[PDB]
RNA sequence: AUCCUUAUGCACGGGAA
RNA sequence: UUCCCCUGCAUAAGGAUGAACCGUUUU
């Protein structure tokens, strides 16, 4: 059993509407994998492992349907904040086939440094999908 | 998960024998 | 007690298609 796989990378993920869309669409499509980023305000990586149709649909999702370029408003304990998303982007670094994924479920972490991010990818032998910095 | 159509069961109202 | 009509609830069959402020996971 081999599974389709895609790998993406984003400059910023702070918009909760997105992060919601990401998690929900991962579980609803039975995609395995993960989504990481270095610190809340950081850039990171998405990996989706699944059947073709799910991965193509999710690709269409992240690429075509979600507009990461548009600014938003972060509701806060203190009051709204004008959140600048004009300098955001998402691209696909990989796609192909994987013999077996040590990926169990799907989750969305936030790593301290880049090293922690690597190691986290190193649990699942995927560090090789990260184009650092 | 939502809409519509068909079939069945239960409850209420109106009319006939 | 039977028949006819309207409204509400549950089950089954068939056809068509969306949203959702949320982080190691609550198919």
SS3 state of residue A97: strand
CA distance A47 to A106: 9
| Strand C positions within 7 A of protein Cβ atoms | 20-27
Resolution, expressed in angstroms to one decimal = 3.2
Domain span holding position A62: 1-133
Instruction: Among all protein residues, pick the one whose CA is nearest to the C1' atom of C23.
Output: A108
**Domain count within chain A:** 1
Q: Say if residues A10 and A36 touch (Cβ distance below 8 Å).
A: no
* Strand nucleotide closest to residue A76 (CA to C1'): C21
CA of A24 to C1' of C19 (A): 12
Nucleotide nearest to A19 (CA to C1'): C22
- Dihedral sign for Cα atoms in the order A36, A33, A59, A28: negative
Task: Tell me which method was used to determine the 3D structure.
Answer: X-ray
- Cβ(A119)–Cβ(A26) under 8 Å? no
Radius of gyration of chain A (CA): 15
| Nucleotide in closest CA–C1' contact with A108 | C23
Distance from the Cα of residue A1 to its chain's centroid: 24
């Amino acid at each position: 059993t081999v599974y389709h796989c895609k790998v993406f990378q984003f400059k910023n993920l702070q918009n909760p509407k997105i992060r919601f869309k990401l998690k929900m669409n991962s579980k609803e499509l039975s995609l395995k994998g993960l989504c990481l980023r270095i610190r809340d305000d950081g850039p990171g990586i998405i990996i989706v492992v699944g059947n073709e149709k799910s991965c193509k649909f999710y690709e269409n999702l992240v690429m075509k349907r979600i507009k990461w370029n548009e600014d938003f408003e972060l509701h806060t304990n203190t009051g709204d904040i004008k959140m600048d998303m004009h300098n955001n982007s998402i691209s696909k670094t990989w796609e192909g086939y994987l013999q077996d994924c040590k990926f169990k479920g799907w989750f969305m972490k936030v790593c301290n440094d880049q090293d922690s991010l690597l190691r986290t990818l190193g649990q699942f032998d995927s560090e090789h999908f990260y184009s650092p910095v």
